[PDB]
Nucleic acid binder design. Structure first.
Ligand SMILES: Nc1nc2c(ncn2[C@@H]2O[C@H](COP(=O)(O)OP(=O)(O)OP(=O)(O)O)[C@@H](O)[C@H]2O)c(=O)[nH]1
Ligand SMILES: [Mg+2]
Ligand SMILES: [Mg+2]
Ligand SMILES: [Mg+2]
Ligand SMILES: [Mg+2]
Ligand SMILES: [Mg+2]
Ligand SMILES: [Mg+2]
Ligand SMILES: [Mg+2]
Ligand SMILES: [Mg+2]
Ligand SMILES: [Zn+2]
Lengths: 37, 80, 43, 205, 118, 23, 157, 422, 140
RNA sequence: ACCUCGAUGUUGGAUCAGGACAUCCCGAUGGUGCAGCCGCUAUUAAAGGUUCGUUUGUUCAACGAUUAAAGUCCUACGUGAU
RNA sequence: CCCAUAGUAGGCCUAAAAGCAGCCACCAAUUAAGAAAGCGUUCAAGCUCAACACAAAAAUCCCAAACAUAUA
């Protein structure tokens, strides 16, 4: 998880989900794509 | 999974679900995943009978089931 | 916590001031009066 | 020569006389380089600011790298830095005369085009890196086509026409209603409240 | 029934009640939900205390005030009671509480597709 | 005309490729 | 502070009031307007010509096959004079009523591929389909006479 | 900043500092190219001054120093003086700056300026700050009486932090913070190389004097068109690794490094730290010499002195493949000393011979063994070898179901193969 | 699985180009090259011939072969050994439309290659495009 | 140059420390060019802890030996009516 | 979301570099597909796209209490 003010899907498998009050880029094939707003 | 049979009457309506199920199940990817698995897409209300490798039968009467529901049940029974 | 540097209302970093509906209505009322004044001076 | 031309740090003949920082050259709407010329796309400056040689290099490198030379061409719509900005030695006390010329900038006013692009291309092909450059510019900027610029101007005109507010900054300032000219500036009589210092408010009517 | 007060919005989790024991590191900030769970009267007590004038009569007024978490009230207080004030907020009715007559009166706003799983 | 629409589709694909070059 | 500042300079309260009063007010449209009330014809001609020329027509669902399997099926069909055709349903729906095929409406849904011919090799075609226990023969209409699969089998025999 | 520079070259006559290998004209040409590198200024005046005591504080004698300061003060167009004296000591810099009225730069400071202005790296900025820490006599061109009496005098019985105490504290704190930041950047640079080391890529460092053609040689070897050599001095700022293929079909990293310079404290230049540590960790060292340059011997001596001062491993010093570039400039050239590969980077004349030579060098250095190995087909042994070791040749026995593969394999990969596929 | 190769009829040599790839899927390379040489004897010798081998899960061979390539065939027809470098301006041989027709006569006849377009226009246009891509000009 | 020059005693140290977290250690957690061991990076966490010496007035720095670590700061560069 | 045959593994180039290492051509057939818009391969093989069909953080302790709906 890296904190980013702007969230970008870095591959096809990244998906945006609003959880615990903020947006997250989650990815299973490339966990390093994990971003937190 | 061992065998899958799909039966329907196209001249009779309410067959879109079963027809799409036939197309998706017969898609070359599934048959390549299990070549041993045999599909018999007969046709003559519409029904789908799936016999698994464990001799277990699933019967889906697709008169009022959407293809998504039929495929989800089929996958769930595959998982067993 | 929550300090305004230096003196309020004068410096570069002033205490924010926000217009209320009351102030907006007052200014609008004065503007209406002055518009009527324009009309009555135009003749 | 479709690629964007190199811009020198300072004029070949350096200015010898220090000149005042007349911020009016940044203040207010732009009256020059406001329309397209030999191009179909551009970077429009929605605010005033000074462009340095660093900004010029950023624009040149980014546009040159991201463009297609065989199908796209770019041209500057802003002159090379000419206005000299002077800085005193670090830690100098106030007084002792004006500082020596440190850098050269070029002023840019709101509503001006900084770079203009054209060629056998459409907007979507260019808007990406034009927006990158605009976002990295020192002032608010936007990648705008001829069509988009005309659309935004027409939208501004439509808002001015159909606004339901009986009171407008233009009217009040011109008529000196409430004596607001005591608070306003003489420039406001022409800015109509759409400009505040170097900042241009587009939603402002 | 001060235990059964209702907060509008997310105040249960956002409203923070702050105090300082005086000793260093004695700053305690407890959310509204936590304070309610600890003391079922503190929320209303503090609200009334804040709304009362900030003078020397406030503590006497708070003495006159009586708060009880649940329906139970002391017999002497009940005998003292004179009038019952109307509740400031009318409690909305739940579906389980809505009568069949009201449900029938309210029209059906749309025709759901017959072949929908819902 | 089949050839007309074939050429139109080819040109549309070319335009899409040009647009997506940067994307 | 200069008239032009790097930051948004604080406005005099009267100027702030003036700006707030002279903000833009959009026109409210009373009732929201939101809730107020070549290739196609080329393949039209192609379908008309196909129907007029072919004496027998059948349809199927050749979508579950590989590219090479579909190519092999096409080659086996072309060994006979029969021709396999692909057309969109979106534009095939009008053709049924246009050519007066009312009974054909509930036959062309989803993937549908035509098997137009004049000389029926239906016997060998069914033999070919037999070794692939899927891709069922779907109802067609020979010479303006709708035939079910039992009808096709009887005609084959 | 559009500066004007007087290039003062101390020509050392007799004693230490007397350069037998090179001439004053060549050295001043080198300095002129150095200053031209920065894109900001150029040499307006050049003076070569004879000196017999280069080690003294003022470098020059009394008369020569007075003569120099006379011209420097008389000519106003000069903004700074570049003293081609390697590094100046702090007292020497202070005295010369005070006498001449303008900033005085030496080779060390000029190179630091090259790094900061051209390669705007945090390393360069921090190094410039570190070297600039000595700061006194702010107002040059004039001696300013100050009369610092009575500032911060005792209030009751003592005084607070005085000047020259605050200056010392700030100096110590700044040195500490700069060193700590430089250490962090060094650790990050080391981190960058972990994956390369684990994959055990043969890494070769191309070293040599500036403009010898290291970048051009790497471009020729790898085939990468992105590499852009330049005629400018110190053009190849920053160190970068490029992959290339050898005749043995092996993949090898060439570490394009910053070119070395004569009379320069490379160990004390922080921007050179990446180059120095990369050559230290290199498996092989490729020494590129521009034989066409008249100062070839001096350039070789300087580079070799730097390499020796690096205290690199003895095997690394040995087997350092020497490549004589720019041979085309010399019409007819014959390498007298053996084991040197004459090549033309631009024209690619001896590149094949160089490739074979350093391929043998890599095989010797990296410890990889060339051997023929038998692998059962359909085992995936062959694919594993394809991935983890270079495969010179494959010969499959159709009947047996095995293949004899001539492969160059490292000890690690060989052990992994033996364990994974016994 | 299906393995595609462009092996030359005469050059049935097991090893460098065929050994590893075929073995990765599992083969009797001796059998494969023996059958390929049988096909080479059946057809002309010394010419590339695309193949469509299908390694069945039962570890058996079904070699499917057809016409020679198009590029080498066109080069042979035009009397060229090595193709043009530019192929847009460089030309090494010319072929007449009649010759193109004649070669096409024996082209659209292979099951695997899919060239079964009944119209002659389809195949002639395809081979014309191939020649234009190659360093061969279309005469008249 | 806004308070203080009919005095606001001002470096470093001792003593006692209050506070912030932008966390040095201990806790939990995501990523890694995370095989393991070491690490690096980011989120959360300020309850507790955060050494002794040689020279140097040093704060610091270097060095010696350790430690889980020997944190960055604010507090009139905290604290001389201690 | 589905789906991808193809003259052929377009030529040259290279040990082979086959849409996918580099340059030039960059057509054309299938109802429908850029000699391929991206991954991957020692090279292949394999996976996708266009095309068919369907905002912010600091150092003594946050800082009025609270409140969305009874007619300006
Ligand atoms: N005639 C000739 N000129 C060469 C040759 N190799 C390099 N050069 C020239 O010398 C220049 C050297 O540029 P680079 O190769 O970038 O320099 P470098 O060796 O990296 O050295 P630095 O720039 O100091 O880092 C080239 O750009 C050419 O102008 C060669 O073989 N022959
Ligand atoms: Mg204040
Ligand atoms: Mg005195
Ligand atoms: Mg004062
Ligand atoms: Mg004053
Ligand atoms: Mg007093
Ligand atoms: Mg934190
Ligand atoms: Mg201070
Ligand atoms: Mg697609
Ligand atoms: Zn991802």
């Amino acid at each position: 998880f890296k904190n980013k003010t702007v969230l970008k899907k870095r591959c096809k498998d990244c998906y945006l989900v609003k959880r615990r009050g903020r947006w997250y880029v989650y990815c299973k094939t490339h966990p390093r794509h994990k971003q937190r707003q | 999974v061992k065998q899958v049979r799909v039966q329907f009457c196209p001249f009779e309506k309410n067959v879109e679900s079963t027809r799409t199920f036939l197309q998706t199940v017969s898609s070359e990817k599934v048959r390549s995943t299990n070549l041993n698995c045999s599909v018999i897409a007969d046709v003559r209300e519409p029904c789908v009978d799936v016999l698994f490798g464990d001799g277990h039968r699933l019967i889906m009467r697709g008169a009022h089931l959407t293809a998504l529901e039929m495929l989800t049940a089929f996958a769930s029974h595959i998982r067993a | 916590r929550g300090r305004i540097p230096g003196r309020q209302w004068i410096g570069k970093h002033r205490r924010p001031r926000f217009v209320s509906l009351r102030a907006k209505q007052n200014m609008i009322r004065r503007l209406e009066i002055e518009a009527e004044n324009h009309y009555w001076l135009s003749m | 020569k479709p690629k964007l031309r190199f811009i020198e740090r300072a004029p070949l003949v350096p200015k010898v006389r220090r000149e005042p920082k007349n911020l009016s050259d940044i203040r207010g709407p732009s009256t020059e380089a406001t329309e397209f010329t030999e191009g179909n796309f551009a970077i429009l400056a929605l605010g005033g600011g000074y462009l340095h040689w660093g900004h010029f290099e950023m624009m040149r490198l980014t546009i040159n790298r991201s463009m297609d030379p065989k199908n796209m061409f770019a041209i500057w719509r802003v002159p090379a830095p000419f206005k000299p900005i002077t800085r005193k030695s670090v830690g100098h006390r106030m007084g002792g005369g004006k500082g020596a010329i440190d850098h050269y900038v070029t002023p840019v006013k709101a509503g001006r085009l900084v770079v203009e692009m054209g060629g056998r291309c459409e907007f979507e092909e260019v808007q990406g890196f034009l927006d990158q450059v605009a976002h990295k510019l020192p002032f608010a900027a936007k990648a705008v086509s001829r069509g988009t610029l005309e659309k935004m101007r027409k939208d501004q005109e439509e808002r001015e026409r159909n606004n339901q507010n009986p009171w407008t900054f233009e009217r009040i300032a011109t008529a000196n209603m409430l004596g607001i000219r005591k608070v306003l500036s003489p420039y406001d009589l022409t800015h109509k409240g759409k400009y505040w210092g170097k900042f241009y408010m587009p939603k402002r009517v | 029934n001060t235990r059964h007060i209702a907060f509008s919005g997310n105040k249960w989790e956002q409203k923070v009640y702050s105090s300082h024991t005086g000793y260093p590191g004695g700053f305690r900030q407890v959310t509204a939900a936590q304070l309610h769970l600890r003391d079922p009267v503190a929320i209303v007590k503090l609200a009334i205390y804040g709304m009362l004038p900030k003078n020397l009569h406030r503590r006497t007024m708070m003495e006159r005030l009586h708060l009880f978490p649940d329906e139970y009230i002391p017999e002497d207080i009940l005998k003292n009671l004179v009038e019952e004030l109307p509740q400031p907020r009318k409690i909305p009715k739940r579906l389980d509480e809505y009568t069949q007559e009201e449900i029938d009166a309210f029209p059906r706003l749309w025709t759901p597709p017959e072949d929908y799983r819902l | 005309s089949r050839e007309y629409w074939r050429r139109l589709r080819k040109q549309n694909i070319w335009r899409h490729n040009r647009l997506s070059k940067n994307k | 502070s200069k008239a032009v500042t790097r930051h948004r300079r604080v406005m005099h309260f009267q100027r702030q009031k003036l700006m707030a009063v002279t903000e833009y007010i959009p026109p409210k449209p009373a009732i929201h307007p939101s809730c107020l009330p070549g290739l196609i014809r080329l393949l039209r001609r192609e379908i008309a010509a196909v129907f007029q020329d072919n004496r027998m027509i059948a349809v199927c669902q050749n979508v579950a096959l590989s590219a090479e399997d579909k190519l092999l099926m096409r080659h086996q069909l072309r060994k006979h004079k029969i021709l396999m055709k692909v057309f969109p349903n979106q534009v095939l729906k009008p053709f049924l009523e246009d050519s007066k095929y009312q009974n054909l409406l509930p036959l062309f849904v989803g993937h549908n591929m035509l098997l137009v011919s004049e000389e029926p090799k239906v016997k060998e075609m069914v033999r070919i389909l037999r070794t692939v226990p899927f891709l069922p023969l779907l109802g067609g209409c020979i010479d303006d006479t709708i035939l079910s699969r039992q009808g096709f089998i009887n005609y084959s025999k | 900043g559009t500066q004007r520079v007087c290039l003062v070259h101390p020509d050392v006559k007799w004693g230490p500092g007397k350069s037998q290998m090179t001439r004053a004209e060549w050295q001043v040409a080198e300095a002129t190219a150095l200053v031209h590198t920065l894109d900001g200024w150029s040499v307006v005046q050049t003076m070569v001054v004879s000196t017999k005591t280069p080690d003294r504080k003022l470098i020059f004698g009394k008369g020569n120093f007075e003569h120099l300061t006379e011209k420097i003060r008389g000519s106003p167009d000069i903004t700074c003086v570049f003293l081609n004296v390697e590094r100046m000591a702090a007292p020497t810099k202070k005295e010369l700056e005070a006498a001449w009225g303008v900033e005085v730069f030496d080779r060390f400071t000029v190179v630091l300026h090259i790094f900061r202005c051209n390669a705007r790296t945090k390393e360069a900025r921090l190094q410039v700050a570190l070297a600039e820490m000595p700061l006194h006599r702010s107002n040059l061109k004039r001696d300013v009486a100050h009369l610092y009496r009575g500032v911060g005098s005792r209030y009751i019985m003592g005084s607070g932090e005085s000047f020259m105490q605050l200056q010392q504290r700030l100096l110590r704190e700044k040195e500490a913070k700069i060193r700590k930041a430089l250490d962090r950047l060094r650790k990050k640079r080391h981190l960058l190389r972990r994956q390369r080391t684990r994959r055990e890529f043969p890494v070769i460092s191309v070293v040599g004097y500036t403009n010898c053609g290291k970048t051009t040689l790497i471009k020729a070897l790898t085939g990468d068109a992105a590499i852009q050599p330049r005629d400018q001095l110190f053009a190849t700022l920053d160190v970068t690794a490029h992959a290339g293929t050898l005749p043995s079909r092996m993949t090898v990293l060439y570490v394009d490094t910053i070119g070395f310079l004569s009379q320069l404290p490379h160990g004390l230049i922080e921007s050179f730290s990446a180059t120095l540590e990369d050559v230290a960790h290199s498996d092989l060292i490729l020494h590129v010499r521009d034989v066409s340059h008249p100062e070839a011997e001096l350039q070789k001596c300087s580079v070799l002195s730097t390499l020796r001062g690096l205290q690199l491993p003895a095997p690394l010093l040995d087997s350092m493949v020497e490549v004589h570039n720019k041979v085309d400039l010399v019409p007819g050239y014959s390498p007298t000393e053996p084991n040197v590969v004459p090549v033309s980077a631009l024209r690619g004349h001896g590149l094949q011979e160089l490739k074979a030579e350093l391929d043998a060098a890599v095989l010797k250095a990296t410890g990889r063994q060339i051997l023929t190995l038998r692998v059962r087909l359909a085992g995936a042994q062959l694919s594993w070898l394809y991935k983890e070791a270079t495969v010179q040749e494959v010969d499959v026995i159709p009947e047996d179901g095995a293949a004899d593969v001539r492969v160059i394999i490292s000890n690690s990969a060989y052990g992994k193969f033996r364990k994974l596929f016994p | 699985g299906v393995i595609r190769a462009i092996v030359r009829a005469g050059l049935a040599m097991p090893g460098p180009p065929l050994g590893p790839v075929l073995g990765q899927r599992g083969v009797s390379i001796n059998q494969f090259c023996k059958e390929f040489n049988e096909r080479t004897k059946d057809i002309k010798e010394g010419i590339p011939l695309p193949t469509k081998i299908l390694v069945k899960p039962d570890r058996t061979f079904e070699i499917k072969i057809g016409q020679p390539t198009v590029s080498y065939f066109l080069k042979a027809a035009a009397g060229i050994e090595k193709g043009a470098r530019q192929t847009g301006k460089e030309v090494a041989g010319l072929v007449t439309l009649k010759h193109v027709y004649e070669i096409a006569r024996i082209k659209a006849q292979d099951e695997a290659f899919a060239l079964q377009d009944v119209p002659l226009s389809s195949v002639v246009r395809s081979i014309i495009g191939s020649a234009r891509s190659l360093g061969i000009r279309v005469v008249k």
